[PDB]
Amino acid sequence: NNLDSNVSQIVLKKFLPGFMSDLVLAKTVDRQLLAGEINSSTGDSVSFKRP
Amino acid sequence: SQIVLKKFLPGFMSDLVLAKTVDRQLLAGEINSSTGDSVSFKRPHQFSSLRTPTGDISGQNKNNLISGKATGRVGNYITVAVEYQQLEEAIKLNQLEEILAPVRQRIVTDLETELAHFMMNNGALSLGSPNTPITKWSDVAQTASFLKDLGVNEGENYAVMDPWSAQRLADAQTGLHASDQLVRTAWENAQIPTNFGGIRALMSNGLASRTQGAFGGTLTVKTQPTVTYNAVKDSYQFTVTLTGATASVTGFLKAGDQVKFTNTYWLQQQTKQALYNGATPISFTATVTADANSDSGGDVTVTLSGVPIYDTTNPQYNSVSRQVEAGDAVSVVGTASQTMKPNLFYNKFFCGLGSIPLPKLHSIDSAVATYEGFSIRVHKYADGDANVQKMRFDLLPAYVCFNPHMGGQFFGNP
Amino acid sequence: SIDSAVATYEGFSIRVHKYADGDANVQKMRFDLLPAYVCFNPHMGGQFFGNP
Amino acid sequence: PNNLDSNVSQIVLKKFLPGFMSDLVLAKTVDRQLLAGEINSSTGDSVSFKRP
Amino acid sequence: SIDSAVATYEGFSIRVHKYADGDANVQKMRFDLLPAYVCFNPHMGGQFFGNP
Amino acid sequence: QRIAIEPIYDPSRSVWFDPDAKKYDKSDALWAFCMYSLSPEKYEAEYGKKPPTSLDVTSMTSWEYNWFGADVIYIAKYYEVRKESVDVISYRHPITGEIATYDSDQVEDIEDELAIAGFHEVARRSVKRRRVYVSVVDGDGFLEKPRRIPGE
Amino acid sequence: PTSLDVTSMTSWEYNWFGADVIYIAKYYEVRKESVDVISYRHPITGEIAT
């Protein structure tokens, strides 16, 4: 009869899994032509010539 | 007609797949004598980012840290008890040995029936029209496609179908053109493979049945619900009131019905972009939990599982494109009052299951019987002084629903 | 046929019984003792108070 | 504002505070040998001693 | 005058700063990463749909 | 390593053999069981406190007997025999005898041989061999993963 | 003061008279404990000695 004070409320130290997405574009876009060309000297933008 | 053989004729038996498929790991040895009647597990955190062109911005409007919970509780007792007169019972009968065999099966059958009821009452996702049965390969591939499109990866999914549906799919498999082994297996044994369209597929004779519940009228939302994360961060349930119903009927919306919000769409949970089903966007759906009637004026209040969070002060927890507001149009899937046996599809981390140990009663003889990985406590005693003996079988389960958005019901579509 | 034991305290023995009700599914315990007093001669004791 | 009271748990330690107690003097001082093991509820409900 | 760190994840570098307000007993952190995009020729890409 | 001899208690209600084996020795048998009792406190001290205790069912006792102790858990050790393909290695160092066939269990790096008293010679012949594994199980799952015992 | 254990054996169809007995028990433990072993290897009159 009315034994609720004996027990305690425990919250476990375990996290339920969440939701994840995928990356395909970042690994397929071109990344070598623009690799460190935007410097402190260059500024906001750079440019490439056209054939 | 007097002499009777000591062998009992064989009987009917169902199969047990749900208890084997659900996760029995997280909730194991957790409801002990100290925790009480409930246990709690944590929830993952999410964050949102800002877009600014300046760097010395040390004073701004930052994020917030809010922690959620998932609560698992115990159920009622599953008890089967018999009384007898020892003279007649021991005339020739084996004193509850021919009772011993079909009682554990009844216990586990009732356990899994209630488990299936719980799963379809708490599931959120829905697919296909209820009337159409399962006939082709797309009806099974769609579950895996949708569940991948939501974004769940941690775990491994399952789908359960009736005995008849497996045969029609195998008949469809029989018509394949190039796989000799598959064609031969389908022709001879009529057994579909394990991996069917990307999802493990299991065939179960025992699946529960539900009746949709009479309804009518173009329902609309009366009052804008409150779906903030502070409100729905502990239970993922919300209460909504609707109009446009009939005058006054009992059982307007029964437990397990699916209501669809037309103008609100699902979101991919991480990218926070809408879902597109090849030709049309996917609308949001919710499941009725308890039976709801309708009073005069067609005002129906109902509690639904699965919440369309669109909080504006904590944007990182949104799950739908737009907020549900007054005047939005809702629909109910299915026909008026037909009864059907639903098919299920779910992730591993959707609903748990556990069992509470039972101590022995003092000065009362007892034993423990093991069946299918479950322990049943059997007690014997002699209450009453009229040649009446009593034996009882006891078991105590515990249930938890982690996230409603990784499971639900699915049907075929034309 | 009832589970029982005894315990001791300050040179006194107390019998403890543990049993249960099956239908109501409850467990109960009881502790019992039985005393006995004698008075040999009333002229060998009493109550004393300080005189004024 | 941080609302993270669901990250902690209400806990009750397994420690009991001290209670109250009394003293036993009279039972120790009075005589027990004469009446010890002399009365059985089965045989009767009384015993007798003879005066000098 | 602020201690910081740099981390790598999926081949991308994120810079983290950690600081605190003195008079309010408050601790704050922040993460930074600067992207840059180029479109060379619009005539080598687009969107495609199924056709009947 | 040492070989010991141990007793078994409650043989009639503990030891179960393969139905197919019909010999007195039980030589023609593929698997076997050995059940023994434990206390919940010992079950907690070993194994783990996380999973509750689930014990096997035999339903043999309580046969006009007064049962008082609900603190006994029945756990069975499980014996199997398997036919496995293992590679033999033949060291033919001429000094102190040449012909010497050995199993892949001992490796020139696992045991510090370092070709001091051994030449690899031929180490490709594969032979099917009879091996015996042991495991510990209950009515719930695997308490200990199977491991081979040194015999036949 | 004296506090005594109980074994619930005696006074069993027997006449008790003296309540002046105290039951005291010795409790034995076995443990696996980490200890540091030291090896003196003095060459004089035998070397290895741990």
DSSP string, chain D: --B-TTSS-B---S-----------HHHHS--TTTTT---TTT-S-------
Chains F and A touch (3+ CB pairs under 8 A): no
Picking from D2, D3, D8, D9 by the largest number of B CB atoms within 10 A of its own CB, the best residue to mutate is D3
Neighbours of chain E (3+ CB pairs under 8 A): A, B
Q: Are B260 and B333 in contact (CB under 8 A)?
A: yes
Taking CA atoms, B144 is separated from B283, B387, B410, in Å, by 18, 60, 11
Q: Are C38 and C31 in contact (CB under 8 A)?
A: no
Selecting from E10, E11, E38 the residue whose C-beta is nearest the C-beta of A34 gives E38
Measured distance CA(B208)–CA(B341) in Å, rounded: 6
Measured distance CA(E4)–CA(F83) in Å, rounded: 60
Cβ neighbours of B387 (radius 10 Å): 12
Interface of D with A (CB under 8 A): 6-12
Query: What value, to the nearest 5°, has the Cα angle with vertex B398 and ends B394 and B399?
Result: 145
Asked if A8 lies within 8 A of D11 by C-beta distance, the reply is: yes
Closest CA to F34 of F151, F135, F144, F152: F135
Chains B and F touch (3+ CB pairs under 8 A): yes
Helix (H) or strand (E) holding B369: strand B366-371
Burial B175-199 (b: 16+ CB within 10 A, else e): eeeeeeeeeebbeeeeebeeebeeb
Measured distance CA(B172)–CA(B183) in Å, rounded: 10
Question: C22: which chain B residues are within 8 Å (Cβ-Cβ)?
Answer: 361, 364, 379, 381, 383, 390, 392
Measured distance CA(B43)–CA(B69) in Å, rounded: 6
The pair of three-digit structure tokens given for residue B198, joined into one six-digit string: 């990307």
Phi, psi of B103 (to 5 degrees): -95, -45
Asked if E40 lies within 8 A of A48 by C-beta distance, the reply is: yes
Q: Measured in Å, how far apart are chain G's first and last C-alpha atoms?
A: 47
F147 beta partners: F134
The residue length of chain D stands at 52
Cβ neighbours of F7 (radius 10 Å): 5
Kindly state whether D28 is in contact with chain G, defined as any CB-CB distance less than 8 angstroms: no
Q: Measured in Å, how far apart are chain B's first and last C-alpha atoms?
A: 57
Helix (H) or strand (E) holding F44: helix F40-45
Cβ neighbours of E46 (radius 10 Å): 6
Q: Are C16 and C6 in contact (CB under 8 A)?
A: yes
Query: What value, to the nearest 5°, has the Cα angle with vertex F51 and ends F47 and F54?
Result: 90
Measured distance CA(B116)–CA(B397) in Å, rounded: 14
Neighbours of chain F (3+ CB pairs under 8 A): B
Neighbours of chain A (3+ CB pairs under 8 A): B, D, E
Taking CA atoms, B25 is separated from A16, B33, B170, B266, in Å, by 13, 19, 34, 30
Q: Are B141 and B198 in contact (CB under 8 A)?
A: yes
Measured distance CA(B167)–CA(D1) in Å, rounded: 57
Phi, psi of B127 (to 5 degrees): -150, 140
The pair of three-digit structure tokens given for residue B53, joined into one six-digit string: 């062109």
Single-letter residue type at B52: T
Asked if F140 lies within 8 A of B29 by C-beta distance, the reply is: no
What is the resolution of the experimental data for this entry, in Å? 3.7
Chain centre to alpha carbon of residue B307: 16
Chain centre to alpha carbon of residue G31: 13
Side by side, the strands of the sheet bearing B283-288 are B220-221, B237-243, B300-305, B283-288, B258-265, B330-332
Asked if E10 lies within 8 A of A34 by C-beta distance, the reply is: no
Single-letter residue type at B370: T
Kindly state whether B403 is in contact with chain A, defined as any CB-CB distance less than 8 angstroms: yes
User: Strand locations in B166-317, DSSP E?
Assistant: 195-196, 199-203, 210-211, 220-221, 237-243, 258-265, 276-277, 280-281, 283-288, 300-305
Chains A and B touch (3+ CB pairs under 8 A): yes
Q: Are B108 and B115 in contact (CB under 8 A)?
A: no
User: How was it solved?
Assistant: cryo-EM
DSSP code string of B293-361: --BTTTBEEEEEES-----SSSGGG--BSS---TT-BEEE-S-SS-EE--EEEE-TTSEEEEE---PPP
Q: How far does the CA of residue B40 sit from the closest CA of chain A (Å)?
A: 5
Measured distance CA(B170)–CA(B190) in Å, rounded: 6
Q: Which residue of E has its CA nearest to A37?
A: E36
> Which pairs with CB-CB distance under 8 Å and at least 24 residues apart come from B183-186?
none
Instruction: Calculate Rg over the CA atoms of chain G.
Output: 26
Asked if C38 lies within 8 A of D35 by C-beta distance, the reply is: yes
Q: The tokens 């020139």 sit on which residue?
A: F108
Side by side, the strands of the sheet bearing B351-355 are A11-15, B38-42, B69-74, B397-401, B351-355
Dihedral sign of CA atoms F75, B359, F65, C5 in order? positive
Question: D24: which chain C residues are within 8 Å (Cβ-Cβ)?
Answer: 10
Angle, in degrees to the nearest 10, between helices B180-188 and B163-174: 140
Question: E33: which chain A residues are within 8 Å (Cβ-Cβ)?
Answer: none
Q: How far does the CA of residue D12 sit from the closest CA of chain A (Å)?
A: 6
Asked if F67 lies within 8 A of B366 by C-beta distance, the reply is: yes
The pair of three-digit structure tokens given for residue B395, joined into one six-digit string: 């078991």
Coil, strand or helix: which one is B108? helix
Dihedral sign of CA atoms F11, F15, F17, F19 in order? positive
Taking CA atoms, B304 is separated from B116, B236, B330, F24, in Å, by 18, 9, 13, 67
Measured distance CA(B286)–CA(B302) in Å, rounded: 11
Question: C12: which chain D residues are within 8 Å (Cβ-Cβ)?
Answer: 27
Q: Are B128 and B409 in contact (CB under 8 A)?
A: no
Chains B and G touch (3+ CB pairs under 8 A): no
Q: Are B347 and B271 in contact (CB under 8 A)?
A: no
Picking from G10, G14, G17 by the largest number of D CB atoms within 10 A of its own CB, the best residue to mutate is G17
Measured distance CA(B223)–CA(A34) in Å, rounded: 54
Q: Are B120 and B212 in contact (CB under 8 A)?
A: no
Measured distance CA(B393)–CA(B378) in Å, rounded: 5
Single-letter residue type at B34: S
Single-letter residue type at G46: G
B345 beta partners: B159, B408
3-class DSSP string for chain G: CCCCCCCCCCCCCCCCCCCCCCCCCCCCCCCCCCCCCCCECCCCCCCCEC
Picking from A5, A11, A13 by the largest number of D CB atoms within 10 A of its own CB, the best residue to mutate is A11
Single-letter residue type at B111: L
Measured distance CA(G10)–CA(G25) in Å, rounded: 17
Selecting from B40, B66, B69 the residue whose C-beta is nearest the C-beta of D3 gives B66
Cβ neighbours of B92 (radius 10 Å): 8
Question: F62: which chain B residues are within 8 Å (Cβ-Cβ)?
Answer: 365, 367
Phi, psi of B112 (to 5 degrees): -75, -30
Asked if D10 lies within 8 A of A8 by C-beta distance, the reply is: yes
DSSP code string of B131-143: SS---SSHHHHHH
Q: Which residue of B has its CA nearest to C29?
A: B362
Question: E47: which chain B residues are within 8 Å (Cβ-Cβ)?
Answer: none
Measured distance CA(E29)–CA(E16) in Å, rounded: 7
Measured distance CA(C36)–CA(B170) in Å, rounded: 87
Q: How far does the CA of residue A16 sit from the closest CA of chain B (Å)?
A: 5
Query: What value, to the nearest 5°, has the Cα angle with vertex B174 and ends B172 and B177?
Result: 100
Q: Measured in Å, how far apart are chain C's first and last C-alpha atoms?
A: 63
Instruction: Calculate Rg over the CA atoms of chain D.
Output: 28
Kindly state whether C23 is in contact with chain D, defined as any CB-CB distance less than 8 angstroms: no
